[PDB]
Symmetry: C3
Subunit: 114 residues, 3 copies
């Protein structure tokens, strides 16, 4: 699984340990080993949500499987929780795009996961 958060929150407002917390929480949520989880945070972005530049986040989660209606609801509660608690972003100013990837469409280690 791989998760990106793009936000207008400043870099200094991202806590030490946030990447490790996302890794652990996503490992637990997806059930995948942490060794397979990648995370990426991009602060200081020029962005707006509903025309407003109050704190917001635009995110992506790519995973080979572990994507679906109930799972994505659970991930959204989890991830919005973390962004609210750690980055002080309101849940209603977060979007997360979920992409279920075929194994043949994810490259890694000189080949794909197929």
């Amino acid at each position: 699984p791989m998760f990106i958060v793009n936000t207008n929150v400043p870099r200094a407002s991202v806590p030490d340990g946030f990447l490790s917390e996302l890794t652990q929480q996503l490992a637990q949520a997806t059930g995948k080993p942490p060794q397979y989880i990648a995370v990426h945070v991009v602060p200081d972005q020029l962005m707006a949500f509903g025309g407003s530049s109050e704190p917001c986040a635009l995110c992506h989660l790519h995973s080979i499987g572990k994507i679906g209606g109930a799972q994505n609801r659970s991930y959204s509660k989890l991830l919005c929780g973390l962004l609210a608690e750690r980055l002080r972003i309101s849940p209603d100013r977060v979007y997360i795009n979920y992409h279920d990837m075929n194994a043949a469409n994810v490259g890694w280690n000189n080949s794909t996961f197929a």
Copy 2:
């Protein structure tokens, strides 16, 4: 809808008001309420288009519906127009990836749109 533009144009060349212009015109073109429109501009990028580092842009528009052949042509005319007039990027140096998202695959406000 969520629109991202990645460009090698420098930050100082992005005019004041541009996020607001994008929000307004995307709301009108997609028919979606402005509250649901998110926009993100990423200047100063290390990029090439056709092997050239002349001004260019690589973009993404995700939307739950309102994506299809005729709509996408319309969006491209609108967005390339804006990038040309505001950022001085030639339309033939812009790519826009359009993604029609299932409601169940978009997280927002602790849940999804499904």
Copy 3:
């Protein structure tokens, strides 16, 4: 075709000429003319892969066609090889998401490729 690499490797570690090498080799791998290839490198990112922040990369390749199991394996070998040799990133710390785009879903030059 368009290729993005997000990495924690610093900007100064990206060698001169790398965008040009990526353009050339992607043109050859996809079979598409270099004039149609776009490349984007994003260094200095706040990322982790498998819980750690040694050099890693999260990438995307979007292409109208030229995507499939054998092609993607060949792209992955090529791209991991380049990231290892030029950016000193281990291949087992690289993910590449491959997206086959419909022509009507790629905007360019005020219209789409349809």
